[PDB]
Design a protein around this ligand. Structure first.
Ligand SMILES: NC(=O)c1ccc[n+]([C@@H]2O[C@H](COP(=O)([O-])OP(=O)(O)OC[C@H]3O[C@@H](n4cnc5c(N)ncnc54)[C@H](O)[C@@H]3O)[C@@H](O)[C@H]2O)c1
Ligand SMILES: [Zn+2]
Ligand SMILES: [Zn+2]
Ligand SMILES: [Zn+2]
Ligand SMILES: [Zn+2]
Ligand SMILES: [Zn+2]
Ligand SMILES: [Zn+2]
Ligand SMILES: [Zn+2]
Ligand SMILES: [Zn+2]
Lengths: 340, 340, 340, 340
């Protein structure tokens, strides 16, 4: 009847860990018993409120929750009890608007979002729409697979919309939680990879993870060096949370190239329109991924092409996690482990 | 042996109509006797030398010249004496670089530009590269067709890269020199047009041209209104590239839509990363087009689908033409008429 | 505490899945919570009790068990709780006999053997000597790394004692659990690899894994075929479970060549003394590997040079797994999955 | 022009002492005048033609001939007339092949064999390849040194390939023609020697030769005894290769030890897989030796460390000699004496 959960009740004060009621699945719904729950930067902004459209208090964050289906309402055919599933950012969509019909459910104006507009995976249980859960592969553990539910699918879809093809150069700007799996997806997609971050150790991660080129932003200029070495990149993926670098990205791309943006920092960034137009440059934002994007991105993990770098932590230490998460002292990703 | 031509001999200075020597075609070159020559703002930027890369002085402006091939250097096959051709902005490209080989010669870093880096059509004769001239439809007169070499191809190619298809919505932002031509291509491409401007007269023109909706930005927030009325436009063509136009385009575009920027404005514009990412928006630069683009835009002119509003003037009055343009007194396009 | 474990209570009889006491770590010992446990053919030899020296009944097999240290006995320094380790065939050795002092602990006459002389990893927990456990690489998953604890280390040491060097030919006879990773170690050690088995599917597997040439012993005489095809090999590693393959390998080497033997089917094989002497052939027994061998063989796995072909099964199905392995119906390794 | 030589004209028949031409050397050849010619069991198999590859008839046997260089052809630098040399089993190798370049000329596919494939030393003179003859020590008589060319180098190289070190144990199995010479090399090589045999005379001789231990296999299990008495031998040299000797060798050897086989018996021998694999035993064939092996073996004889038991006989009594060898009535080695 009760469960442990990290409930945000005040739009900025640390999360509390309380016994709350276990959500029961109604018709068309299922219940998921959480084994692991990934922590995303988005969770910070949910706890805080750096976003125009804000969560409703109180709520439970977590859109990288993974576990088994523990119960099922009527009318459900996609999943059964004991199925291995994840509940990602896109909690549900109407399924029949123009966006949904065209396989862009990610843009559905009637969408609900896990751990933001409805309760998420920072609890021992979570109710989900079985039509939009991620179907998880057996061969990959809960802790290792959690980050794919958001970080993975986000950078996978992001790389797809750079419109770069095998043999061409992709730049991964920022080798963090997202960035570091981005390197791995890019390689599996046959791309040549260049990495660029403020941290020279993060650049070593990229090097090990497959990148054949990396330069430090806080040293030389990324643009000038890349235009110099590789001849500019055909595509750029910006994962870097920092407002700036959404400008030096325009410079690392060669003419006719595409920059996909994963970051969600605040405020307007300076866009050199003259150069964008003359160099025929494309700038494109990419929102996580569709259900197909997600399944494809999980497949890459199953096959061993992709493997998240992950720090484990306990539900009760959630606030500790948020702390070091902000101070950029987190390597790769952090995943809450519910294992007893 | 000699000819008259408007010449820029110093930046910002009135052009002087000098007697100068007729240029002669060497091997792989042709000569063109100019019968009409389009004028546009690009010419003002050339004469003022206020773009990052200036022209070399002295020079003859004009990248919208049309006339008859009057001489043929050796090794030319594409055109012959008597052919009707235009000499567009793209004078030549290298033909072997990555861009040229992929049918993107407009991104060629070794390209020459007519009436800017090489002498243009503000004179009785001009030497051109037969491989890069525009082949003109028999049906259309020299004066009427001249602006298609610039305004025509620019907005046509711009509409193409908005990645819209028949039946979908496109917003044409700014119904002026470019815009009133864009409206017509848009219609011919099976698109539903929403016109946006602050000038009621320009808006009335859009309606006459087939615009299904016309919104005045002065009285109405077109972003709010279009989102309310049609859930946004699938494509936005910004023909008057300015901060207010850029921001509002981002507001008017439907989620997952594409914005094409048609101009070359100074400075950095503020881009709302957040909105661009959550909405999955594409921002894209487009000016003029390839030889294929041009031929396709010419064909629309030839079928009677597209007619530029045009007025004429004499070579001797080029400075006056510049004056009206600079003051913003020009309705449509001004074309220099060399006809007897 | 109790746990599930597969137990051998009578030779040739199906194993039973019993509830048994969790083994506790005494002084100098550690306890390992098993995540995955490879099924070696030695396990069948043991359960069937077809070796001259029987294992004590009853016993829990499994010497490819890997997981986390879950408890530490007093006085342990080498490893700590949470460490990822495996418990190989060589459970322990005396540490001070002639063999042990010369880094050949695999020959220690006082050695104990995991899942034979002491209980092994066909269970939820196993107690291990921390001085002899395998220290697993972070980079690799439990399921994938498990076969390296015997299959990998065995064929790696075996390849080492063939006394071949980069550029020379080695024959792998039997592409099963051991042989399929042997192909990869061989390639990683710069050898040209020839594959021999009695099943085209194993041969096809070997071809995918880097075998330059391959032959089905059932379809022609393998020794003669190899003599013509490659001029006889410089070395041969015998991982087959048929005494006949042993005799045949002796005819696969060129003069001066070395045959190394890993396979352990009961009985004798035929040594052609005359040809062995005349041709100066060396025949060599090779038994698993030392702690050094094991560390090195794990490093090849961490570097991505070697990757076991694996399929998982549940503890409950151990008998169906044994049956399939008996009838040659297994490709690569079967790894018992104890993961959540 | 003419000389006496014992000739085999029909396999298995008695030899006849015939008058045949004296072989004269051409370019790159020397002539040797025989002073003594050792006899061994290889000569019996040559005369009987009972090996897989047979001598061509007619032929003169003898691969233990020693004497003086009596003539030289052009282009000979290694020896000169008057030099004391022997013409061993390895008459010549190609010098170009893999084996020849790796110091294993004994394995040369193109080798010729003295008194087998080419005429040998059962005659007054023999033609030889100066690059392959043995260079005999000054201080040892012809009769005494003859056996070192065959028996000597065989047990010496054999001992070398047991890969034993001074201070370690070696078993000499069989103290006959070869064995009594082997005991001596072993002691000279600083090994502790254990003699094994069924004949009590041969064992008393081993003790006289420095064998620290001796066991009669008729009375006691030499394996069980040696394992208990010394912990098993580091190496075993089997000079009399019978299935029993071979089997017991596998039992007598210390784990990780090496068994070298000097004999050429027929048939396949049963080799216990379990024992060879688990005990990590090396089994190695070895007969004769390289030119280097020979020179080294001669040096030991030269230093008085090795002396073969030799009986002399005349050329005309060769058949009588063969009979003695067949009936196993020979103590030591028989050598034909051509001296005055
Ligand atoms: N002691 C050691 O040095 C070390 C460690 C213990 C295990 N052993 C032994 O290694 C052997 C193999 O182990 P495994 O797990 O890979 O068994 P496995 O069943 O997985 O593989 C056996 C392979 O041998 C092949 N086989 C049967 N007859 C063959 C033939 N005539 N020619 C070629 N291949 C033939 C099979 O086709 C099969 O592919 C076992 O006997 C095992 O006990 C090695
Ligand atoms: Zn997220
Ligand atoms: Zn929808
Ligand atoms: Zn123009
Ligand atoms: Zn080019
Ligand atoms: Zn094993
Ligand atoms: Zn020991
Ligand atoms: Zn001999
Ligand atoms: Zn040779």
């Amino acid at each position: 009847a009760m469960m442990k959960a990290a409930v945000v009740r005040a739009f900025g004060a640390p999360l509390t860990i309380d016994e709350v009621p276990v959500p029961q699945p109604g018709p068309g719904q299922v219940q998921v018993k959480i084994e692991a729950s990934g922590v995303c930067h988005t969770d910070l902004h949910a706890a805080d409120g750096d976003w125009p459209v804000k969560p409703t208090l109180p709520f439970i964050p977590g859109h990288e929750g993974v576990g088994y289906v523990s119960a099922v309402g009527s009318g459900v055919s996609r999943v059964k009890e004991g199925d291995r599933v994840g509940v990602p950012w896109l909690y549900s969509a109407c399924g029949y608007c123009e966006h949904c019909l065209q396989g862009w459910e990610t843009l559905c104006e009637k969408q609900q979002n896990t751990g933001y507009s409805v309760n998420g995976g920072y609890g021992e249980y979570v109710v989900a729409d079985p039509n939009y859960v991620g179907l998880l592969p057996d061969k990959v553990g809960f802790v290792e697979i959690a980050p794919i539910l958001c970080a993975g699918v986000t950078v996978y879809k992001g790389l797809k919309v750079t419109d770069t093809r095998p043999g061409q150069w992709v730049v991964i700007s920022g080798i963090g939680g997202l960035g570091h799996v981005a390197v791995q997806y890019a390689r599996a997609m046959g791309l040549r990879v260049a990495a660029v971050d403020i941290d020279d150790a993060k650049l070593n991660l990229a090097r090990r993870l497959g990148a054949e080129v990396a330069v430090n932003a806080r040293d030389t200029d990324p643009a000038a060096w890349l235009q110099k070495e590789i001849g500019g990149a055909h595509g750029v993926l910006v994962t870097a949370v920092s407002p700036k670098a959404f400008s030096q990205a325009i410079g690392m791309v060669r003419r006719g190239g595409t920059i996909a943006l994963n970051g969600l920092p605040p405020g307007d960034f300076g866009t050199p329109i003259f150069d964008v137009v003359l160099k025929g440059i494309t700038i494109r934002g990419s929102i996580v991924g569709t259900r197909s994007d997600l399944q494809e991105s999980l497949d890459f993990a199953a096959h061993g092409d992709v493997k998240a770098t992950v720090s484990t932590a306990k539900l009760d230490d959630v606030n500790d996690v948020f702390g070091r998460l902000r101070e950029g002292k987190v390597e790769g990703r952090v995943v809450l482990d519910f294992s007893r």
